[PDB]
Curated annotation (Swiss-Prot):
Catalyzes the first step in the D-alanylation of lipoteichoic acid (LTA), the activation of D-alanine and its transfer onto the D-alanyl carrier protein (Dcp) DltC. In an ATP-dependent two-step reaction, forms a high energy D-alanyl-AMP intermediate, followed by transfer of the D-alanyl residue as a thiol ester to the phosphopantheinyl prosthetic group of the Dcp. D-alanylation of LTA plays an important role in modulating the properties of the cell wall in Gram-positive bacteria, influencing the net charge of the cell wall. GO terms for cellular component: cytoplasm. CDD domains: DltA. It holds the Pfam family AMP-binding. ATP binds at residues 152-153, 288-293, 379, 390-393, 488. Belongs to the ATP-dependent AMP-binding enzyme family. DltA subfamily. The lineage of its organism: Bacteria, Bacillati, Bacillota, Bacilli, Bacillales. This is D-alanine--D-alanyl carrier protein ligase.
Length: 500
């Protein structure tokens, strides 16, 4: 029943099954409950009637998960902080959030923070000192109490409650057709809510989380060696991450014979990427999902079949979970007729209760409609018979020749051209106005003897897809597209190197 109870069920039924593994470090469900219980018991003894959020610092160590559960068992929401988050932002989070404690298995490198730091051996000592102890079942986070708080770079703390997470997880477990005892890949740092899509569905279904870290990602040979040993069955990642893995010829069914489900969220999933996955993994089901962190990971989802790939050049993002609903709003706070583009607004139990301590910010994006919470995504899109389509971020809309064009739509067409394997549009601005567009593309196999031949071929094909003023003036070619630590296109890095 209760989220924690459905997880703990596996501690009793399959105590020795691995719950989380990172390189050679692993922990069973039995161990997870034990240490988590010990930590919650300790938290409860150190902060008797306190329920302040607790920071959990690290990368992919099993302790990250132990600490998450320990925090909620004592009634505290946790704040995931990845090692890749700049110290400056960590310092802010420590102050924006009334957190009084930070937990980390590894050494904390961020300059003195206004919180009690429990790390390294000090964390080990609580697992030992409180070994065998159990917390008051009644202290566990429940109802509309915060379960976790994830900050959205920008930096505001999105508060996700117990009800919010239960609403997402139940839907994920049912509609993503997960089973039990499956191996789940974890690619996203815990500071990115995409990780929630694999963490909880895995735990409630007695699965095994197989973590891949930053260093491994940097060393392809290590990365691919890990996947080969993983036996991963449920793959949760950003589209960019899968695309990079796709650059390796051995990334196929042969490497992951028991692959059964691909779950994507966070960015546009190119029709081309899905096609390649079906070819490489004819036994796997591909799911595209959409949603902002402010709406608890994702609210829409759709099975990307051959038929879907056939009728939608640009893949839809899915049907809204049944306990929530969508609204497409145009120019004014008026609702748009189905088919018309407008700003995507989400309403239902998946919507966050708001940004932590940010009144003005919450008032601008969060609203109440018929008694329930609503959230303006800032995303442009439309619906057709319950199916939601994503056009792009309003903030990314470029204007040239008095014409407005979603940046993402231009990338869609560039990506669709022959000889293009990966591509990003970098707008070059001359002040407040757009000067011209620069296309960064990863060339596919070709026989062009000189660069201009390739650029000419792409511009000609692109001329059949876009108005001339939408076609990028300059092209740059490179073997790969950079990703941020979260696994998304590093647009800022690209703008930087093109500017210079
Ligand atoms: N399936 C999808 N297809 C296209 N875009 C998607 C999809 N899923 C999510 N997105 C995009 O990602 C956004 C949500 O990402 P997230 O909440 O993790 O932070 P962010 O907006 O990307 O960056 P920041 O933290 O600065 O706000 C959505 O608003 C949408 O623009
Ligand atoms: Ca956002």
């Amino acid at each position: 029943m209760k989220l924690l109870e459905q997880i703990e069920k596996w501690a009793a039924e399959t105590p020795d099954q691995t719950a989380f593994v990172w390189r050679d470090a692993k922990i069973t469900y039995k161990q997870l409950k034990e240490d988590s219980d010990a930590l919650a018991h300790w938290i409860s003894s150190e902060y008797p009637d306190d329920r302040s959020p607790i920071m959990v610092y690290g990368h992919m160590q099993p302790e990250m998960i132990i600490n998450f559960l320990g925090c909620v068992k004592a009634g505290h929401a946790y704040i995931p902080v990845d090692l890749s988050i700049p110290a400056d932002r960590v310092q802010r989070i420590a102050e924006n959030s009334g957190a009084k404690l930070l937990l980390s298995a590894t050494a904390v490198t961020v300059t003195d923070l206004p919180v009690r730091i429990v790390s390294e051996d000090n964390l080990k000592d609580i697992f030992f000192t409180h070994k065998g102890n159990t917390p008051n079942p009644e202290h566990a986070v429940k109802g509309d109490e915060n379960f976790y708080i994830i900050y959205t770079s920008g930096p505001k703390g999105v508060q996700i409650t117990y009800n919010c997470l239960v609403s997402f997880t139940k839907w994920a477990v049912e509609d993503f057709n997960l089973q039990t005892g499956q191996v789940f890949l974890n690619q996203a740092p815990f500071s990115f809510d995409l990780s929630v899509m694999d963490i909880y569905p895995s735990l409630v279904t007695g699965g095994t989380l197989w973590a891949i870290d930053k260093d491994m990602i940097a060393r392809p040979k290590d990365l691919f060696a890990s996947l080969e040993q993983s036996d991963i069955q449920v793959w949760t990642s950003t589209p960019s991450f899968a695309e990079m893995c796709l650059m390796e010829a051995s990334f196929s069914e042969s490497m992951l014979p028991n692959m059964k489900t691909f779950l994507f969220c966070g960015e546009v999933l190119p029709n081309e990427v899905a096609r390649k996955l079906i070819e490489r993994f004819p036994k796997a089901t591909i799911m595209n999902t959409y949603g902002p962190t402010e709406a608890t990971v994702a609210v829409t989802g759709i099975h990307v079949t051959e038929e879907v790939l056939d009728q939608y050049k640009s893949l839809p993002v899915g049907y809204c979970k049944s306990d929530c609903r969508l609204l497409i709003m145009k120019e004014d706070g008026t609702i748009a007729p189905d088919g018309e583009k407008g700003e995507i607004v989400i309403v239902g139990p998946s919507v966050s209760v708001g940004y932590l301590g940010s009144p003005e910010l919450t008032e601008k994006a969060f609203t109440m409609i018929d008694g329930e919470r609503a959230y303006k995504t800032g995303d442009a899109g439309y619906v057709e018979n319950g199916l939601l389509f994503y056009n792009g971020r309003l903030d990314f809309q470029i204007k040239l020749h008095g014409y407005r064009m979603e940046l993402e739509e231009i990338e869609h067409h560039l990506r669709a051209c022959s000889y293009v394997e990966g591509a990003v549009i970098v707008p070059i601005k001359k002040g407040e106005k757009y000067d011209y567009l620069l296309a960064v593309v990863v060339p596919g196999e070709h026989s062009f003897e000189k660069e201009f031949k390739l650029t000419s071929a792409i511009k000609k094909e692109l001329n059949e897809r876009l108005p001339n003023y939408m076609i990028p003036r300059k092209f740059m070619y490179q073997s790969s597209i950079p990703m941020t630590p979260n696994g998304k296109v590093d647009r800022k890095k690209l703008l930087s190197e093109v500017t210079a």
